[PDB]
Amino acid sequence: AQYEDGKQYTTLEKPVAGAPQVLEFFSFFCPHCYQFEEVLHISDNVKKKLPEGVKMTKYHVNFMGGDLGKDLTQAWAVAMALGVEDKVTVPLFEGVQKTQTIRSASDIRDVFINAGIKGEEYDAAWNSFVVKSLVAQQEKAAADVQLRGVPAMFVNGKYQLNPQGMDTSNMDVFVQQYADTVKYLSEK
């Protein structure tokens, strides 16, 4: 087959029922995640190829970066709750990995303040039970698929993308193969 179980994707030994249709995991500490999001723009290109009625979810993980990693999972919950993912993703990646100016929870907050979220609104969201539930959802989704690395993408709780054997000499061709594979998996 052109797409083969065990090659371009793997089928989860213990499928996860009720999972999101397309589920990404990342860490703002993760160098390949920086490439995936900042240089390759994987999520955007996957979205552009996906059928009607297939929605995408992206969650942060705790297992990189210790205390600040867990602070970033809560900040990502704030971003989701406020709908400001597209305003804070680049400055959070750059703050952690490029300028290395994000060293504390206050530095994370500064990114949201600079992006135009009012301080009282950020603080209310940060401390809210709506955000606690989003943090729990991110942790549960990672636990469901027994996640030990990022970046990772899962389709319909059944299939995991396997980019490692793909040709990466051309960034655009790689992204297109990745997106076309997600599309194929979504149609199974």
From Swiss-Prot:
* GO BP terms, alphabetized: cellular response to antibiotic
> What protein name does the entry list?
Thiol:disulfide interchange protein DsbA
What are the protein's GO molecular function terms? protein disulfide isomerase activity; protein-disulfide reductase activity
Indicate the segments forming the Thioredoxin domain, all copies.
Answer: 1-131
Q: What does this protein do?
A: Required for disulfide bond formation in some periplasmic proteins such as PhoA or OmpA. Acts by transferring its disulfide bond to other proteins and is reduced in the process. DsbA is reoxidized by DsbB. Required for pilus biogenesis. PhoP-regulated transcription is redox-sensitive, being activated when the periplasm becomes more reducing (deletion of dsbA/dsbB, treatment with dithiothreitol). MgrB acts between DsbA/DsbB and PhoP/PhoQ in this pathway.
The entry's family comment says: Belongs to the thioredoxin family. DsbA subfamily.
Which CDD domains does the UniProt entry name for this protein? DsbA_DsbA
Q: Which gene encodes it?
A: dsbA
GO cellular component terms?
A: outer membrane-bounded periplasmic space
Q: InterPro entries given for it?
A: DSBA-like_thioredoxin_dom, DsbA/DsbL, Thiol_disulfide_DsbA, Thioredoxin-like_sf, Thioredoxin_CS, Thioredoxin_domain
Q: Which PROSITE patterns match?
A: THIOREDOXIN_1, THIOREDOXIN_2
This protein's UniProt keywords: Disulfide bond, Periplasm, Redox-active center, Signal
- Disulfide bonds, paired cysteine numbers: C30-C33
Traced from the root, the source organism's taxonomic lineage reads:
Bacteria, Pseudomonadati, Pseudomonadota, Gammaproteobacteria, Enterobacterales
Name its cellular compartments.
Answer: Periplasm
Tell me, according to the record, the phenotype of the null mutant.
Induction of the PhoP/PhoQ two-component regulatory system, suppressed by 50 uM CuSO(4).
